[PDB]
Design a protein around this ligand. Structure first.
Ligand code: NA
Ligand code: NA
Ligand code: NA
Ligand code: NA
Lengths: 331, 332, 331, 332
């Protein structure tokens, strides 16, 4: 039996659910040979009501070099980056839910990802299998990938289908915890674009640049646009696509018209659909946002680490696209 | 005495500061023959402790068309846009602090700005005069404009000079209320870009596109870079610049090496510096973030309206730069 | 028109309701010739969610000597005392809801009360008239005073009559905001004793010592004890009494058996009953706890001050009891 | 493996620390062949953010009689008393931190303490050994006992020495979690009195009455009184004393002038100092407030129970003091 000393960065909805999940499942962890010992939880305001015991909270950065593991679910990019890098340079692994971080600081983070120090299942579709789904898909070669990767924009579209306005639906999405007070990253497709980047790096190109993704959000959509789609036997969804074009991989996020019985259109939750050679057509669905769903992913990654398995590796080298085969209707 | 009927969108840090500031100032408002009456306050979570009466809280959108004013202090672009448009279409003015809305939804909002229906002093440098400052600078032709527009990135650089790390300073900037939980828009220069666009539109080109601003944040900066600048007699700041290059106006946001005695380097707060002909060199400084600071600007605009003055107009035409210019050196 | 600069001490339920009430009624205050300007609000944790704008909060003591008025609704005795004394010595008035303070620090506070610098209607029966009720009763001489002065213990007794247990009722009282997490002062009769002391000082003896009050709380009471009272045509209430005995004033708090149709037994809320010569029998009832009820009292006192009227003065000299006349059944 | 069924009363700072500490230590508990299972957690407000699962929260009292243990960390006396009595009557042990309950409801609780059913290490100096410390000191006859028992009043004096005012220090003591919103019980010496009573009952008189302790708080103290003590080579502390006078044990709480080199004056935390015959002079120090510190004591008691040991017993008889003693000088 050994102690697993954990530094948690972020005590929001994600960080709180992960804290409580770790302790609630400490009986599982002992089967893996450890007892969880949180060193501290970096938070913005330590005197705010929060579902973590108050004495464990830290308003200021603390030394991570004594941790066995860093778990991060902070907002943003540069501050978490600067906090995690000294831990990663010391060979301490990182489990993170921070898709922005990984999408936007990859020049700094790739060498540690290549060494198996970064676990980030929770950074795409929360605790729904997504990174692991693509790790198994690596048996095949990708022909086309389409996902519905953001929870907020799925929620808003579903509600606008029912005749709720954008604003009404957004307010609801904010109360359910899918969206922040400023939902810009969600509703402009940028969160889908960060997640799409990460999918690309795992499966097809370990250098894929976030800046190459072409992203458009849901701003042109209204209940009318959606009802008319429905009349045409279609549903409109914000889709994240990865496909070959003129010999290179291209990534796009945009509203797309789907057949109404397509797996993407029907899905229970966020979804990832792929067509690959020789496997064929495969699909995964589940919750893509929320504290408990995200914490599940972080905890799956902690078990992965405890079992002796390395983190999520980028593709070992860029793969060649097979189909230039390049799909679509936009709205 | 008559009611001045206000619909308020947003009951957070700004919207609550504004609401309580309006109540404080009810005696001042009676000097225009009005009493402030709120039709409703749009908020996300009606359960949260809030210095606004529970009975005025609205968790869902409410009809705006009886208002005399809509005041908006929500986050993001599209939802505020869709909420305000029917009021603007009805000829109801909008008072807003939402620099992103204005920068990014200008195709929709420009016509109403042209009719005097949009008041937005608080969208740049909060209640520090910035838009009014340029309104007065219209008396000259612009040579160049350089501003330190974002509160969070000023604060973080100020702290890093003193030896603090980025993350320490950020966290404090967040506790102070300059930066949100996700401060990406601040620290990547995007907030300064949004503000820069609005200054360009007021002064020199009423169609100036947000997408044309070149923006880069503070992510390459550290206490050691700032300390080496200091030993060279410089200060590094994130600067928003508007200047002529090749006969076209160029807008950029980037870290710049300033002479340490420059007004911009010595700024008490956020700052806007402007050389124009024939005036010369003028400068304004003051707080550029914060609940009260922002509410001061919103309320300045309410008084502007009540006094009979229209909102902030775009430049009446675009025109080319009078002279070729250049910002300070960037950071190597 | 002038500015009224206010320092508020305490931003709890009382301090928050008083802040918001002052601004909501600023149109009234302008009729009194002022505009309210809060200097700052002393709070324990300034980053806690609170119904006061965050920038006005102060985690540390601030200079009061620039205020026109101090309003205090802090817990406890010695800290508020030390905070208010320099303001009182500078001739700045105090409006307070803090019955403990006044009951327990009267050696320090009496000289300022005698000068009309302390307003404390809200310290007894919240914004229900109580101090003002006794100021008018001063036309007569007191024969006997009986009050039901604590909200929590009234609430618990009322609920236990209906068959709710003590603990159940207390938990409820805590959610309604009558009682704190540790309700000891309420349920031991000590809060009634502080309030009774203050009533005594106003009407009968400006030196009345808090330490002379004989207090017993509600610990012997159960739903059974109460149901049996009801069977005897009685109600049991915790009563605060002031009466003459052997030539002196005596004050007691204790459970007492009341006739069920007595005004004290029926009262809508907390209550004060008096029999005085020559007026006769008079009575006042209303809410005795809660943020809005307390804020009402503080604001009544602010209007009192703004109108030019002094604070609540102690009796000018101890009065002689007329009846030694000394009542009771205990339980 | 079997369930150790726990009913927890209180989900605040202590009860939440305790709950999470138990979950942390589930591996340690398996070494006794048990897994911790909570029947319910009694809390005031089930809506508040809390590190305990929502489904275990109980806003109303719940049946305790299936528990193997009741752990209590509520405030006040009567309501906890009425909640725990039926469990004690059923032979279910109580683990508690509630010094007021024990001090003030002893007529009801003494019989159960005599049967080994009450564990209360955390009721004095939190998880710092205090009750176990006296259990071992039973090997001698008590000469005198002097303790610095309250965390808030130690903290405030420590700060006032350094020049802080009372109110500044208090507010920080409250933010640190030593003192509640109303800190009257701490600062008036009543909490130290409650603790002193319990030490007396364990050591010298199982019926010792709380009402016989003479208590006086820190209200006469200021930075200037403490600074004058320091210039005389002294430190002023609030001390809880048990000592013989006139053949009877006397219990007092008051400010005392200590020699600055005395163990009590130099205490790292709250402290308990004891001269006894034939042992000599013994001393224990450690944190005497705080969520984690308190939970450590509660959990120590859980382990004591699980290991087969009974709770803290009162002294088996009363007896008179062996010698006539005296505390330090009070503060002039
Ligand atoms: Na996932
Ligand atoms: Na401005
Ligand atoms: Na009253
Ligand atoms: Na202890």
């Amino acid at each position: 039996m050994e102690a697993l000393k954990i530094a948690l960065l972020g005590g929001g909805t994600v960080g709180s659910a992960f804290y409580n999940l770790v302790l609630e499942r400490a009986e599982e962890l002992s089967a893996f040979g450890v007892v969880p010992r949180f060193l501290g939880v970096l938070v913005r305001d330590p005197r705010k009501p929060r579902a973590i015991p108050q004495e464990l909270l830290r308003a200021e950065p603390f030394d991570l070099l004594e941790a066995d593991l860093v778990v991060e679910a902070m907002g943003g990019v540069e501050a978490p980056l600067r906090l995690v890098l000294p831990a990663l340079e010391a060979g301490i692994p990182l489990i993170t839910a921070n898709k922005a971080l990984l999408a936007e600081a990859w020049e700094s983070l790739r060498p540690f990802a290549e060494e198996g120090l970064i676990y980030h299942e929770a950074s795409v579709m929360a605790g729904t299998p997504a990174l692991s789904f693509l790790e198994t898909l690596r048996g095949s070669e990708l022909l086309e990938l389409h996902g519905i990767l953001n929870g907020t924009t799925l929620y808003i579209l579903q509600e606008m289908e029912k005749g709720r306005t954008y604003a009404e639906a957004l307010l609801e999405a904010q109360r359910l915890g899918y969206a922040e007070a400023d939902p810009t990253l969600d509703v402009e497709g940028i969160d889908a674009a960060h997640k799409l980047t990460l999918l690309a790096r795992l499966l097809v190109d370990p250098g894929f640049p976030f800046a190459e993704v072409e992203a458009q959000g849901i701003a042109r959509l209204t209940p009318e646009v959606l009802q008319k789609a429905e009349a045409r036997g279609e549903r409109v969804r914000l889709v994240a696509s990865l496909f070959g074009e003129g010999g290179r991989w291209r990534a796009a996020v945009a509203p797309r018209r789907l057949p109404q019985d397509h797996p993407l259109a029907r899905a229970r939750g966020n979804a990832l659909w792929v067509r690959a050679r020789p496997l064929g057509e495969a699909f995964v669905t589940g919750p893509g946002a929320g504290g408990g769903a995200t914490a599940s992913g972080l905890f799956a990654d902690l078990l992965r680490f405890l079992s002796g398995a390395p983190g999520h590796l980028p593709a070992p080298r860029a793969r060649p696209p097979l189909e230039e085969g390049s799909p679509w209707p936009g709205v």
